[PDB]
Design a protein around this nucleic acid. Sequence first.
DNA 1: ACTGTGTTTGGCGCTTCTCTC
DNA 2: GAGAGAAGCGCCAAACACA
DNA 3: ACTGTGTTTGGCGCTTCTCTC
DNA 4: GAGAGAAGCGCCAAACACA
Lengths: 278, 258, 278, 258, 296, 296
Amino acid sequence: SPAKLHSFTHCGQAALTLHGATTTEALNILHSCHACRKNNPQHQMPRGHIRRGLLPNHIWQGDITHFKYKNTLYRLHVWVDTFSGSVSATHKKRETSSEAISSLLHAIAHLGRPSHINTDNGPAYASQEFQHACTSLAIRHTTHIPYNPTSSGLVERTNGILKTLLYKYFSDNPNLPMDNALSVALWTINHLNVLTHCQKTRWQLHHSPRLPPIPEEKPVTTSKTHWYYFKIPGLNSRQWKGPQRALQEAAGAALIPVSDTAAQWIPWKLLKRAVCPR
Amino acid sequence: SPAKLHSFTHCGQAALTLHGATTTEALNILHSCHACRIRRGLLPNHIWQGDITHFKYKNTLYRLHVWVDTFSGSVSATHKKRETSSEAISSLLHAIAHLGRPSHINTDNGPAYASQEFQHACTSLAIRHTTHIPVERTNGILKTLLYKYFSDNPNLPMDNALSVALWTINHLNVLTHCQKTRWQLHHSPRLPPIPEEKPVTTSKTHWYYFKIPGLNSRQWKGPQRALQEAAGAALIPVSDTAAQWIPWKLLKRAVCPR
Amino acid sequence: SPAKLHSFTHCGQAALTLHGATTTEALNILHSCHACRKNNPQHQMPRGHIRRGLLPNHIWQGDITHFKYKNTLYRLHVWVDTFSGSVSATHKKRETSSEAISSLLHAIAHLGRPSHINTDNGPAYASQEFQHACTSLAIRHTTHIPYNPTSSGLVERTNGILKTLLYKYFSDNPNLPMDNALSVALWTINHLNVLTHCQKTRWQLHHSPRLPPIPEEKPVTTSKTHWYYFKIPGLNSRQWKGPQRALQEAAGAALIPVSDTAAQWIPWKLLKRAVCPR
Amino acid sequence: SPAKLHSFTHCGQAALTLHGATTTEALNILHSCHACRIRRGLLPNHIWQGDITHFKYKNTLYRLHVWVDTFSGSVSATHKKRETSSEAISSLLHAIAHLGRPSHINTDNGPAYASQEFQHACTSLAIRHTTHIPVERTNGILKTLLYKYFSDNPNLPMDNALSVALWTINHLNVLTHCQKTRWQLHHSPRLPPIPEEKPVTTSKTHWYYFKIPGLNSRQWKGPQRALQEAAGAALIPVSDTAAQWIPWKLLKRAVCPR
Amino acid sequence: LLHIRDVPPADQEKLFIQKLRQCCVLFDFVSDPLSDLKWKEVKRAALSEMVEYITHNRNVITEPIYPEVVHMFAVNMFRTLPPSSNEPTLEAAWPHLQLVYEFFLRFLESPDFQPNIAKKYIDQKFVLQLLELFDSEDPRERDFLKTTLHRIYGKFLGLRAYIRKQINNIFYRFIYETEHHNGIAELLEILGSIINGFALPLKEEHKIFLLKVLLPLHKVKSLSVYHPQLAYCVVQFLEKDSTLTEPVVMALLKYWPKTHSPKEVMFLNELEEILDVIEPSEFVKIMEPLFRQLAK
Amino acid sequence: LLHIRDVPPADQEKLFIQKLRQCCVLFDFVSDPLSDLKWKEVKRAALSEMVEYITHNRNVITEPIYPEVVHMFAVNMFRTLPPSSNEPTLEAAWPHLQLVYEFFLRFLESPDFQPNIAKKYIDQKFVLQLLELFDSEDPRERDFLKTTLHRIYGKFLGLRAYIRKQINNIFYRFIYETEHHNGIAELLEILGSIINGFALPLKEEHKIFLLKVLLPLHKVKSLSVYHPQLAYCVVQFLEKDSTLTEPVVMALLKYWPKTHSPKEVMFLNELEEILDVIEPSEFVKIMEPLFRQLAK
DNA sequence: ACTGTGTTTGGCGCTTCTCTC
DNA sequence: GAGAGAAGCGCCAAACACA
DNA sequence: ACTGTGTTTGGCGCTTCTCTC
DNA sequence: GAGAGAAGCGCCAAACACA
Ligand SMILES: Cc1nnc(C(=O)NC(C)(C)c2nc(C(=O)NCc3ccc(F)cc3)c(O)c(=O)n2C)o1
Ligand SMILES: Cc1nnc(C(=O)NC(C)(C)c2nc(C(=O)NCc3ccc(F)cc3)c(O)c(=O)n2C)o1
Ligand SMILES: [Mg+2]
Ligand SMILES: [Mg+2]
Ligand SMILES: [Mg+2]
Ligand SMILES: [Mg+2]
Ligand SMILES: [Zn+2]
Ligand SMILES: [Zn+2]
Ligand SMILES: [Zn+2]
Ligand SMILES: [Zn+2]
C-alpha cells in the first residue's frame, strides 16, 4: 500500500508510483502528509515590494548606519525618497530622538516636506518625541514588521552605496575630514551619478515637472483567507509551525494567530501554503 | 492648517494662500501674529556670493557661512563656532551638495577665501574665484527668521531653527516679482535649445514585458508602453482601464512589435 | 577633465560621459582606477565544480555531521560516491581517527573499495593514523582548500537530505531508536528514492553494468597567468587585496602569493580580474 | 599488490587471479601463508535465513545476528553484546539497508523472532515470517575469517574485523560453481521480460543544451545527445573527437531537432 | 454628468467631447466674489478630471477631438486685457486659468499628438491671439505662455519665420511706439532657446535681428527688470562666430550713457562676460577705444 | 599500426576495418603457455581500444562495417569444443575471449545499431553456431552467451520461433538421447524472460511446450544444479492462467519418486510456491489426491 | 591537484476524458 | 451528436540549507 | 497597513571603420 | 578596389551587501 509505505518511510512521489499508484494519488499523499511539509524547508510564495510614492515627497524611508573612522563611530541618518531616490544624509555622534528630529528637519530643508515616512521600529523612531515632531508637521509615520530589514530595502541599499563611496574617498586621503567626504559623496550621488534603469539622475527626477497628477488608488483587498505554516521572523526555526488560519491577508503579509491570545503580521517569505483540515 | 504652518514657520502670505488659506484669512493671521506685527548672474549656479555673518546670543556667538546664488537668491548656510579656511571649504562643499557646482564665486578679502588652501580647493573643482574689498538683504531675512524662531521657543538646539529657516525661505516664501519660490526658480529645468531646419521630435519611451506583483506568476504578459519612469518603478497600464507602478525587477526591456 | 573629475568624485561612466568623453575612454578610466576596483564587492569569475569519478568506486566524498537526539549529540560519518550518489552513513558517539577508519571500512563493506577519496581538512582526516590506513588499502587521499565547505558540495547536500529524513521519522516516533531510523533512512535513500535528473535510484547506478570503460583524461592546463585581486577564504574582508600575479592557475582555483614567503590556493569565487601594471 | 591484499584480507585464489596475480603466484601465496595452510530460494531477496551465532573470546562473548540470502549467499551480519527482540529488529533493518526488502524470512523458534514486537515489525514491512525447529556453512566461513583476522592482529576493536570479513566474502571471494562473487550475483540486474508480438526497441536518451565549464559563458552551444547519465553529470560529446562529463547545472533539457 | 472612466470605451470619446464643451461656459470672478459657486466648483472638478484622464491613456487623441480643444482654449484665454494699473495684482480667475493652462500644456506634450493635424486648426491668427496675451501683468500667465510658445515653436515647422517677424514687430513697437510692456523677460528667454540651436554659417537675417532690434533694446529705461536674459542672448549669439563681435562692442560703447548714473554698472557686467570670451583669437582691434571709453 | 582516434574522420572507418581484420588471427593458449607474447599483448590492446572507441561515438556504424564484425566473432568463437573432463576448469584463452565477448555485447547495444541490416548477415546458421556454444563448461562463456542470446532474441522478430524450436530440440536430446549437458541453468532463465512477456489468451504451442519438454525435465538426475530456475519458469507460466494448473500438478505428482531419497525435499519446495498461488480461485479439485500422495 | 549541489514546489502547457444543449 | 470544461500528467525555475 | 533593492561587471550581438591582396 | 579584422558601443544576468 502506497499510504502505508509512505507512512513508514516517507518516500518520494516516484518511489510511491512504482509500488502502484497514479501520479495524482501519490501527489495527494505527499500533499496531505504533515511530517513532510513541516520539515521541508522549501516553499513557493509570492514576493513583496515596499510601498512607493506616487510623486516626489510622498513617501520616504529612513535608517541609521554606523561608520568607523579615526577610532570614532559615526551615525549616519539617511532619508531616501521612494519616488526619485534622492538621498539626504547627516553624520552625528550618537543615535537619539533629538538627532532623529534634527536629521529629519535637515532632510526637509534639503528636499522638501513629505506626506508619509516609514522606518523600522528603532528605539529613536518609536519615541513620543519623534511622533510629536512628526504630528506638528502633519507627517504620518508608520513602522515595519519587526526583525525584517528587507521591508526597508531601498534605504538599506542606499546605505551600502553611500558607504562604498565613502570608502573610495578615504582610500585616497586618510586625513580627509568626514563632513567634506560626506558632502562630496552626496553631491556625486544626487547630481552626478545616473540611475541604472531610467537613465536619469536623482535630482532630475526630484525636480521634474510635477504636471502628471497623482494616479488614483484602490483599497480593495482579497476577501478570502487560507491556512498557513509559518516561521516567526524574530527567531529562526528549523521546521514550520502551524498550520493556522489567517484573519486577513494583505498584499505582502498576513495576520497569523501565533498564540491563543495575540496575532501577528508575517511576510509572505516566511509563510507556506497548507491544506484545509476540513 | 495654515494657522499652524504660520505658528511654526512664520512664512509669508503667498505661502499661506498657496495652501488652504484665503487672502483675507492670511491677512487676519498676519495681524494676529504678535511676532509678525538686481541679478548680476545670468544663470543658476553661475555666480555666487559668499558672506560671513555673526549671530548674537545672550552668552555666546555663532558664525554663519552663507552662500547665495545671484540669479535666484537661493540660500545655503552653515553654522560654526569658529572660522578658518578649512571651514570655508566645508561650507562651500555643503553648498555644492545642496545647490550644485558654481562656475564663479565672489567674496571679500580676509584670512579665509584668500589662503592657499582655499585656492587649491577651488582649482580642484575648476571654480574661478574673484576677490573684492567694499547681498546683505538675505542676511537680514535670515537674522529676522532666526530671531522669530528663538523668540517662539528659547530652548532650541540652534540647528533645527537654521534648518527650518532655510526650508521657509527656499520652499515656502514666494519671491514678490516673479511670484515663484526660490527653490522652484533655482531648480526649474530650462528651455532646451531648438535646432534649426530640424523638427523637434517627441522622445519615445521604451516597451516592456511585465508581470503582476503578488501573483508568483512566471509568464510575461505581453509588451506594453510606459507612461512614466522613476527610481524603482515604471507606470505600466495593466489594462485599458487602470495603470499600476510595476517595479523594475518585474520588468524586461523589449523591442517595439512594429 | 574626466580624469580629474573621476579622481575627485569617483563618479560612474554615464557621469563621465556627459562631461565629455567617449564610452571607451570613460570605461578605461573606470577600469584603470584602483580605488573603484578594490572597493566594489562585485566581480565576474567562472564557477567551479567538484571532481567526479569516471565510474563507480573511483572518487568518494566524506564528512562528519552532528545530530541532536535524546540530549545526546551523535556524529554521523557520511560517504558519498561521486558517480552514483550512493550513501553510507554510520552514527558514533564522538569524532576520532579510529571512528573515521571504522566508518571507512564499513562504507567499503557496504559499497566497495574506492580508488580516491577527498575530504575537508578535518582534525581526524589529516592524522597519520588515517593516512596509514588509507595507504594499506591503496587509497589515495586528498584534501580541500581550507575554509571552503562548498568544495565538498555533494557530501554536504547529502548531509542535509539525511538529516531531513531523520527529522521526518522522529516526528512520528520520538521513542524510535536511532539505529532503526538510520537504517530505514539509508534504505529509503539508496533503494527507494529516485534521483531528480537521471530518473534512477542510487543503487541502480551503483550496480549498473560496468561495460562502458573509463574515458581518457588530459592533464593539460592553461599555460598563461594573470593578475588578481583576492580575498582570503578563512577571514572575510570588506575590500579586495592585491593585485598580485598568479604562479599558475588550474581549473577552479589559482596560486596567489599572499605574502613575500608563502603562496596559497584561492578558488575563483574569491578572485577578481585585474589589469597588468606594465 | 596481491601479496598485501592476501596479507590483509586472506581471500581466495580466484580473488588474487582477478587482480594482477597469476595462478602459480596465487598458489605460492597460498602455501606461503602460515594462517591459510542447494538454493531453496528462487530470486534474490526472496527467502532469507536468520541465525544467531556466539563468538568466543578469551574473557568475553559476542552475539552475531546473521542474515543470509538463499539464492546468492549474500551475508549481512551485526555484532551485539546481548540479544532480544528489538535487537533482532535492528539487525533485520540493517540487513534491509544493505541488501533490500525480503519477501519471506525464515528462522528458528526462540525468545526473539517469535514475540509480538517482531511480528509487528514484519507486518509493517509486509514480510511473511515462518518458524521451524531443527545455513551453517556461512557461519563457519565467517568464524574462520574472524579468527584469522584476530590472529593477525590481537589488538582489533572487533568492528573493523567484521567489516573486512563481510567485504571479503561479499566482494572478494568467488563462488566456485558459478565463478562469480556474492555481491555481483546478488545485485546483478536480471533479464527484462520480452513482450510478445512487439519488437524490443532501444531506449533513446534525451537531448541537451550545454555550456563548457570554467568559461563563464552565457550562450548554450547547440543541442547534443548524451552518451551516459549519472548522479550529478552527463557524458556529452563536446566535439567529434572527445567527450566530457558536464554537470546538470550547465545542462538544459531540449527537444530533438527532427 | 458622469465620470469619463466609468463608461464603455465605445462612447467614452463622446463624453470627453461633452465635458470639453462643458468648459466653454464663462464665469466672472471680478464682477462679484460670490456668484454661481457650485458651477465654478464643478468646472474645477471637470478640468482636474479631464487632465488626469488625458495623461494616463494612449490612443485617445483622434481627429474629431483636435479642433474644438483649441476652441475651448480660445474661449477661455483670447479676451480683452484687464485695465492697466502699473506688488503686482493677480487675476481673480486664476484657479480656472491655471487648470486650463496645465491641461493645454499636457495636451500639447501627449506622445499621441500628431503635428500634421494641427496645421489646419492652429494658424497665424491663433499665434497672434496667443502672443498678444504676453502683455499680461500676471507673471503666472507669462511663465505659462513662455512654456507654451516654446513647445509650439519647436513642434511646428511652417510657423517659425512668422513668429520671428512678429516678435521683431513687437520689439519695434515696444522700443519706439509704446514703452508700456512687461512680457519682455520671457520673450528673450525663448529667443535664447532659439538662438542656441543655430548652425554654421549664420544667416544674415540673424545679423539684421541683432543689429536692429537686439542691441538697441539697451536704450530703454526699464532694462533693469530684464538685464540678464538679454545679456544671455548675446552670449548665445557671438559664441557661434567671434568675427562678428566688433559691431556688437561698437554699438555697446555708443549706447553707454555719458553721464553718471546707477544704470552704468549693469553695462560693465555685460562687458565682463564679453571680455571672458573676446580675449582669445587675438581680438585687440577695438581694445584701445574700449579702454578709452571705459576710462572716462 | 596507429590509434583510431588520431586519424582524420575521412579514413577513420578504414582504419577501424583494418583493426577489425587484425583480430582475425588466432592464438593458441593451450598448445604452450609462452608463444608470441607480444602478438597477444597487441591483440589485447587493440580489442580494448576498439571497444573503448565504439561506446563513445555515434554515427560510426555503417553498412560496410556490418558483415565482417560478425565474421570476426565467427572467427573467434565458432570452433570445436574442448574435450570433456567432467572445481571446473577455465579456458586458457579467456583474456581475449572476454575482450571479444564484451566488444560484441556493447556493439549489439549501440543506439545506432539498426535491426533491419542484420537480417542479411545474421541468419539461422549463426543462431545454431551460437547455441551450440552453450555446451561449454566455462561458466563465464555461458553467462555471456545468456546475455547475448537474450538481446538477439529481443531485437529480432523473424528468428524467434526458430530459437524456440531449436531449444525444444535440445531439451529433447538432453532429456532422452544424451544426458551430458551443463548449459541448462541459463537456458531456463532466458525462457523465463520470454514467458513473462506473454499475453492473453495463451497460445496452445506454449501448452505443448510445458506438457512435453518442461514438466518431464524433472526426471533428470542432475536437476539439483538447476532446480530454482526451472521452478521460476513454471511460476512465470501458471500466473497468466490459473485454470491450466491442474495438468501441472497431475504430472508433478506422477514424477514424484515413490522411494525415500534426498531429492524429495526440492519437490516439496516447488509445491509450496504453487500452493501460495493455487489456494485462491477455489482450487480443491486435486487437493485430495495431492494430500494422499503427500502423506505417503 | 585546486573547484557547490540535489530536492521541494505551485504554476504552466498539454493531453485525455466526461457531462450538457 | 459534439465541442467545451475538467481531470490527468510531465516539466521547471526559484528558493533553501548543508557548522 | 503589512511587503527587498540598486550598482558593478566580462561576455555577447551589432555597428562602424581601416589596413591588405 | 573590396571584403575581411578591428574598434566602438549598448545591453544584460548573476553576484553582492545593506548590523
Ligand atoms: C525589533 C528589532 N530589534 N532589532 C531588530 C532587527 O532584527 N534588526 C537588526 C538586523 C539589527 C537591524 N537590522 C537592520 C538592517 O538594515 N539590516 C541589514 C540588512 C539590510 C537589508 C537586508 F536585505 C539584509 C540585512 C536595521 O536597519 C535595524 O534597524 N535593525 C534594528 O528587530
Ligand atoms: C581549516 C578549517 N577549520 N575549520 C574550517 C571551516 O571553515 N569549516 C567550518 C564551516 C566549521 C566547517 N564547515 C563545514 C560545512 O560543511 N559547512 C556547512 C556548509 C556546507 C556547504 C555550504 F555551501 C555552506 C556551508 C564542514 O564540513 C567542516 O568540516 N568544517 C570544519 O576550516
Ligand atoms: Mg535600522
Ligand atoms: Mg538597515
Ligand atoms: Mg567537515
Ligand atoms: Mg560539511
Ligand atoms: Zn510524509
Ligand atoms: Zn507669524
Ligand atoms: Zn575611481
Ligand atoms: Zn592468507
